[PDB]
Amino acid sequence: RPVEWVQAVVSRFDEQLPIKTKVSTEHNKECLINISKYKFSLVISGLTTILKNVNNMRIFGEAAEKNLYLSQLIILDTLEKCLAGQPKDTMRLDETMLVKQLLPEICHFLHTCREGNQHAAELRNSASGVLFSLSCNNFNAVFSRISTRLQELTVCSEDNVDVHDIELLQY
Amino acid sequence: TGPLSLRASTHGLVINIIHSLCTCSQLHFSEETKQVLRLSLTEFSLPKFYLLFGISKVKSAAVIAFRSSYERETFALTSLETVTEALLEIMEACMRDIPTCKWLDQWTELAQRFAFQYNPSLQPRALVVFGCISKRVSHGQIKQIIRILSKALESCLKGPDTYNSQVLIEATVIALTKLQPLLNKDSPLHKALFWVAVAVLQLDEVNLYSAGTALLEQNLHTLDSLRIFNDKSPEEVFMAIRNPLEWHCKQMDHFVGLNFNSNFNFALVGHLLKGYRHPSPAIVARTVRILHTLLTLVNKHRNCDKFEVNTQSVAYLAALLTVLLDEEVLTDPKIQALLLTVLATLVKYTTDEFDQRILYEYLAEASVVFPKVFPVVHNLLDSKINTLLSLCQDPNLLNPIHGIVQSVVYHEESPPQYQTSYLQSFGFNGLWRFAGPFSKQTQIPDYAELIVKFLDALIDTYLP
Numbered sequence: 045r046p047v048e049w050v051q052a053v054v055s056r057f058d059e060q061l062p063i064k065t066k067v068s069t070e071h072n073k074e075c076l077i078n079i080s081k082y083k084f085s086l087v088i089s090g091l092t093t094i095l096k097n098v099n100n101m102r103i104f105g106e107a108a109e110k111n112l113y114l115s116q117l118i119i120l121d122t123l124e125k126c127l128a129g130q131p132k133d134t135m136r137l138d139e140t141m142l143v144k145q146l147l148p149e150i151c152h153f154l155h156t157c158r159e160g161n162q163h164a165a166e167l168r169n170s171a172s173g174v175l176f177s178l179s180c181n182n183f184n185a186v187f188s189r190i191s192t193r194l195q196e197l198t199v200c201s202e203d204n205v206d207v208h209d210i211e212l213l214q215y
Numbered sequence: 216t217g218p219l220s221l222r223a224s225t226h227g228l229v230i231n232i233i234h235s236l237c238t239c240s241q242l243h244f245s246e247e248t249k250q251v252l253r254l255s256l257t258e259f260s261l262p263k264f265y266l267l268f269g270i271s272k273v274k275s276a277a278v279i280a281f282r283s284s285y286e287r288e289t290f291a292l293t294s295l296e297t298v299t300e301a302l303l304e305i306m307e308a309c310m311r312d313i314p315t316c317k318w319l320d321q322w323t324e325l326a327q328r329f330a331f332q333y334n335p336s337l338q339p340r341a342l343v344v345f346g347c348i349s350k351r352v353s354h355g356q357i358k359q360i361i362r363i364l365s366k367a368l369e370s371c372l373k374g375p376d377t378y379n380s381q382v383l384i385e386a387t388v389i390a391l392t393k394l395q396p397l398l399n400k401d402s403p404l405h406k407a408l409f410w411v412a413v414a415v416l417q418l419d420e421v422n423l424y425s426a427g428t429a430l431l432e433q434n435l436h437t438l439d440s441l442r443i444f445n446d447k448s449p450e451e452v453f454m455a456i457r458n459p460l461e462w463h464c465k466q467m468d469h470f471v472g473l474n475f476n477s478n479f480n481f482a483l484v485g486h487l488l489k490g491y492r493h494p495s496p497a498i499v500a501r502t503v504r505i506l507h508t509l510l511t512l513v514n515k516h517r518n519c520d521k522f523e524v525n526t527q528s529v530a531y532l533a534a535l536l537t538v539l540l541d542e543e544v545l546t547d548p549k550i551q552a553l554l555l556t557v558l559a560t561l562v563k564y565t566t567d568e569f570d571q572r573i574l575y576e577y578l579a580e581a582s583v584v585f586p587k588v589f590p591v592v593h594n595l596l597d598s599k600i601n602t603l604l605s606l607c608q609d610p611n612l613l614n615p616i617h618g619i620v621q622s623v624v625y626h627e628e629s630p631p632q633y634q635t636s637y638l639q640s641f642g643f644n645g646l647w648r649f650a651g652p653f654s655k656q657t658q659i660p661d662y663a664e665l666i667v668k669f670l671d672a673l674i675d676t677y678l679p
Contacts, residue, residue, distance in 0.1 A: 046623050052601050068608045075617040082625050
């Protein structure tokens with residue numbers, strides 16, 4: 045079935061990211077965008093899965109954080125292009141949990157604070173860009189998140205969730 | 216036959232025979248005859264005729280003819296054809312000046328007696344010799360050849376040892392090949408043998424495939440020379456001769472999965488498609504010539520030019536394209552589906568860069584042109600494309616692959632228009648099975664009894 049073909053496409057994009065042949069993976073990336081033009085749901089779900097796995101993966105060594113920086117930059121820009129090219133028509137509706145699955149890593153690993161700014165200042169820029177291009181479609185989940193955390197500010201003054209959550213209102 | 220010494224002795228015998236044939240005053244030949252015999256002696260001295268005679272690696276036959284003083288290689292009947300034709304040339308050249316020598320009559324009788332009686336060690340050779348030498352043939356002789364073919368088929372079916380009967384089948388086919396042009400044009404057999412040829416192509420044996428292709432080639436050339444194609448298509452006359460005994464051929468078509476009833480030209484291309492998987496390239500070139508002459512006949516029947524894309528001629532263009540696609544030309548879904556299946560087979564089996572590239576670039580366009588019937592050929596390219604999509608680092612191959620992927624992903628809204636089993640709706644199935652590579656077992660497929668019954672019905676209708 046062609047779903048096996050598209051999953052092979054996404055994995056064929058994927059294997060370069062444990063490493064981090066350039067022209068081949070560039071053609072693969074533009075093919076990813078062309079497929080995400082028609083059906084982006086499974087593409088986005090797979091990209092969330094891959095990005096969550098990569099950022100969740102714990103590796104060490106100077107070349108290892110260089111690899112993480114380069115890989116996360118690549119994933120962020122590819123996700124940005126696929127998110128921007130998605131509305132070929134007026135199709136704004138996305139599943140709320142699919143946004144919510146995308147939500148936490150983007151909302152935290154660049155916006156708990158300025159994280160790795162000497163390398164990840166532009167990563168923060170790219171995260172803000174994908175967050176804007178997401179909230180132009182389905183901001184209502186994020187808006188509900190903002191309301192719920194403000195409600196969560198109940199009593200105790202020992203809360204640092206504002207830099208984690210309220211600052212997201214900026215972008 | 217035999218060890219090195221006897222084969223070298225046979226070669227020395229041939230050389231001494233020609234040598235004494237030219238250097239004797241008893242025969243008093245002409246000068247030009249002596250010239251052609253002198254040429255023949257030189258051509259037998261060549262290493263090519265060493266390899267024909269089975270002696271390889273040996274510099275001098277005369278040295279090892281006497282080597283004691285001081286079987287591994289197989290034998291192929293085409294070498295015997297070349298040797299017998301050379302000897303026939305020599306014998307003809309010498310009998311031209313000799314009045315009423317009657318040598319050829321004696322040799323034909325000596326061939327006839329050994330050819331038509333049962334002897335497994337000698338009958339395959341005697342059949343080929345009688346084919347090459349004879350200058351006349353009758354209905355009874357060729358029908359005896361067909362009966363011998365049928366009996367060899369039955370013996371190959373019942374017997375575990377098959378090589379001996381296969382050799383006889385191959386010799387039978389090439390004897391038919393040599394004997395067809397001498398036959399009178401009024402015999403219907405001139406057409407009927409065509410079906411016999413494709414029957415051999417169903418027997419998926421390498422030497423049998425080569426012999427069937429040779430029979431088909433000479434049949435097409437001779438039958439074109441007798442001008443039966445002047446007013447009629449290759450479709451019409453062959454279904455006219457296959458009209459009575461079609462029931463057995465109906466079971467045959469059900470088993471092979473290719474119906475000549477519905478689509479004649481796409482049936483023939485399915486058979487001839489195995490030629491590209493033959494190991495020897497000469498058979499490949501012969502198949503190309505077969506496709507070319509059929510394309511010319513089909514196009515000139517409709518008074519168009521060569522390379523003219525139309526309904527009937529599109530299959531030959533698809534086959535020859537490896538060595539445009541117009542929807543307005545090909546409106547029917549069945550024909551365009553079969554056209555897609557041909558390309559899917561050729562991309563599945565062939566594994567060379569240029570051909571898979573040109574066929575992928577052709578196939579991407581057909582996905583745009585014919586998206587509804589394009590799922591039918593999905594599975595035939597399901598694995599291979601994926602494998603390339605995994606490990607093709609060359610951009611030029613993966614770009615049409617990406618185009619095909621995007622074209623299918625866009626058009627996934629309506630699967631149930633057609634399925635991969637739609638080909639089983641009518642007859643055509645296994646067109647990917649029949650174009651597969653040659654099997655190592657090379658065992659004859661049963662339904663060969665149906666071939667036996669088919670040949671028997673041929674004899675029963677046309678001989679008496």
